[PDB]
């Protein structure tokens, strides 16, 4: 079962969040009968000291009807040219339980994201995509 989600964070260059602080997306679902609910969590200034130079990006399982979900996922960024870039995928399915996340503590360097030459914050918005695949 596939899930796709697009998240636009407005005014991203002005986030006040300090290292360790998190912004959470709305939930998304398959639209089908599996009852699974997901959301994204980003740390604009990284999860922790080790990752302070990075944006940290995670997929969170918000609800599932039984105990565990195995899912593959992929995150990418929309650029100013209208294309998905910097996509990274889980190389395998990971085991999710309700309230548990998986993702990339070092998803993209902040100094790359903020360099206008890379076009990743058009109109100062960060647009992220997430694809989820559940067995």
């Amino acid at each position: 079962v596939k899930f796709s989600y697009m998240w636009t964070i407005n005014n991203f260059s002005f986030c006040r969040e300090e290292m360790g602080e998190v912004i959470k997306s709305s939930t998304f679902s398959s639209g089908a009968n599996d009852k699974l609910k997901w959301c994204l969590r980003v740390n604009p200034k990284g999860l922790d000291e080790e990752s302070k130079d990075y944006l940290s990006l995670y997929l969170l399982l918000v609800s599932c009807p039984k105990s565990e979900v195995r899912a593959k996922f992929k995150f990418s960024i929309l650029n100013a040219k209208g294309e998905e870039t910097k996509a990274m995928e889980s190389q395998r399915a990971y085991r999710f339980v309700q309230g548990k996340d998986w993702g990339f503590k070092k998803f993209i360097r902040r100094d790359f994201l903020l360099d206008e030459a890379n076009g990743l914050l058009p109109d100062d918005k960060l647009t992220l995509f997430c694809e989820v695949s559940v067995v």
Binding site: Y58, D101, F104, K105, R109
Partner: peptide, 14 residues
């Protein structure tokens, strides 16, 4: 330096 633009390692925040 270990300053790649991205790192592909998957982890969980717990």
């Amino acid at each position: 330096n270990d300053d790649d633009v991205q790192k592909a390692d998957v982890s969980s925040t717990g």
